[PDB]
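Teaching soon. Got one?

===
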Amino acid sequence: AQYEDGKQYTTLEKPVAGAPQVLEFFSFFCPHCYQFEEVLHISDNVKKKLPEGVKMTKYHVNFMGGDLGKDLTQAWAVAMALGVEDKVTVPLFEGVQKTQTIRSASDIRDVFINAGIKGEEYDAAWNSFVVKSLVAQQEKAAADVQLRGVPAMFVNGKYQLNPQGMDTSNMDVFVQQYADTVKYLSEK
């Protein structure tokens, strides 16, 4: 058929109970993640095609970048808690990978301050238990899908996107097929 298990996607041996309907994992340290978000716009193209009443969730991972990597997962928790993901995603990627001006937790915070988040607001979030549980949620999600690498995307906690099984030459055919596959999976 058009969409095939083992081709555009794979199926989790061990489906995840109560998972987000569309769950993306990434790292601000991840060069393929930079491409996925800043050049290919995968998240955006997937969301443009999602059915009504399907929300897209995006989590950061710890395993790249040591202390800074964990700082970024905690800052991504701050971003989710404050609801400012669409204001910090681009400058966090560029600061880590383009200008490489993000070297410490303080450098991360600067990105938020510059994006209009009050310092008192960032710091209270940063030190909050709400944010600690959001970090724990992201870590738990990774454990639940038995995550091995980023970027990755899972649908209804049952299916894993398999971009290696898609066409890779028109960047845009690739992106279209990726987004089309997510929509297909969401209705499966």
Notes: The two ends are 14 Å apart (CA to CA). The helical segments are 31-39, 42-47, 66-82, 85-98, 105-114, 119-126, 129-144, 171-186. The first helix runs from residue 31 to 39.
